Amino acid sequence: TLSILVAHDLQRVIGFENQLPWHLPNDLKHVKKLSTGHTLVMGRKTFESIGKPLPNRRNVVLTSDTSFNVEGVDVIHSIEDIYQLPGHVFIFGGQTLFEEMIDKVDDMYITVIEGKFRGDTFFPPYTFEDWEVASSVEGKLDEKNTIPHTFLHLIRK
Numbered sequence: 001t002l003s004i005l006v007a008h009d010l011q012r013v014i015g016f017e018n019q020l021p022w023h024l025p026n027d028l029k030h031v032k033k034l035s036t037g038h039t040l041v042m043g044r045k046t047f048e049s050i051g052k053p054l055p056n057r058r059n060v061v062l063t064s065d066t067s068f069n070v071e072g073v074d075v076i077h078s079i080e081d082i083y084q085l086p087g088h089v090f091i092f093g094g095q096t097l098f099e100e101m102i103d104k105v106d107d108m109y110i111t112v113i114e115g116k117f118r119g120d121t122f123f124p125p126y127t128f129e130d131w132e133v134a135s136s137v138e139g140k141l142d143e144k145n146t147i148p149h150t151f152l153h154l155i156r157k
């Protein structure tokens with residue numbers, strides 16, 4: 001299976017200045033739970049944003065940099081390389097990766113952040129005519145998680 005994981009706001013903002021525009025611990029937990037024991041593929045900028053590979057899954061970084069060789073990270077230099085990775089593969093960001101892969105993935109696990117943030121990077125437009133709503137679950141709000149959010153699982157029709 002090849003899936004996208006993304007958190008985007010009401011206007012499909014995904015990032016600002018190489019970080020998330022929002023603080024939402026529950027999204028991080030969501031992503032951790034879904035990808036445990038699986039594979040994440042991310043662009044070079046996203047990797048540098050997190051700074052270190054996420055433990056307990058295979059971290060794959062897509063970059064043109066042939067000098068890239070980081071401990072705990074596997075490197076690829078082509079989109080085509082993604083299709084050679086075994087198991088459940090998650091496209092992990094950022095904008096460039098999402099743009100390159102949205103037409104290729106089986107499904108998408110989206111955290112819709114139900115707000116309007118300042119962004120400099122976006123998830124590409126998509127239509128529910130192309131995607132079946134496998135599930136839609138409202139996120140619980142509390143002291144640590146104060147922005148309304150919805151977890152969508154979309155499967156390509």
Ligand SMILES: NC(=O)c1ccc[n+]([C@@H]2O[C@H](COP(=O)([O-])OP(=O)(O)OC[C@H]3O[C@@H](n4cnc5c(N)ncnc54)[C@H](OP(=O)(O)O)[C@@H]3O)[C@@H](O)[C@H]2O)c1
Pocket residue numbers: 005006007008013014015016017018019020042043044045046047049062063064065077078079092093094095096097098100121
């Ligand atoms: N809300 C979310 O779900 C989420 C998730 C992840 C990231 N983000 C946000 O997304 C933003 C980053 O997105 P971005 O588009 O600027 O960067 P990005 O997609 O993370 O990384 C872009 C880099 O990936 C490499 N790359 C992409 N396609 C390639 C290809 N076909 N062949 C070789 N290398 C390739 C290049 O690295 P080189 O220049 O080294 O060659 C490119 O500069 C940040 O704001 C971040 O916070 C949001």
Ligand SMILES: Cc1cc2nc(-c3nccs3)n(-c3cc4nc(N)nc(N)c4cc3Cl)c2cc1C
Pocket residue numbers: 005006007015018019020027028029031032046049050091092093110111
């Ligand atoms: C501990 C932790 C730290 C994180 N930092 C980040 C950053 N994202 C952008 C810049 S830095 N994330 C992320 C959260 C994500 N959430 C969803 N829904 N989908 C994605 N593709 C995500 C990707 C990342 Cl890197 C993180 C996810 C976790 C679990």
